[PDB]
Amino acid sequence: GEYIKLKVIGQDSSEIHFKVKMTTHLKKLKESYAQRQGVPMNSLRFLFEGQRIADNHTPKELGMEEEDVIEVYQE
């Protein structure tokens, strides 16, 4: 089926998982994560295999798959 689940790991090793489509712009994940952490989205950088995830990157563009990890670091 079409949602994949991505694991977002915080600096404190906490995890929030997100269900997204392959075509979803990951800005929406970044905004949801920042909201739930209580911090401004622009205070964070989101990385996939160490590379910065842009607002308009999609899982398809980045080659993401079910249960791939995103790491969040301070900007």
Binding site: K5, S14, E15, H17, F18, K19, S32, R36
Partner: peptide, 17 residues
Amino acid sequence: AEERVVVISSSNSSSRY
């Protein structure tokens, strides 16, 4: 911590404001 899964949602004539 418990598992947390968030579903990200997709990307007028009823309006009054």
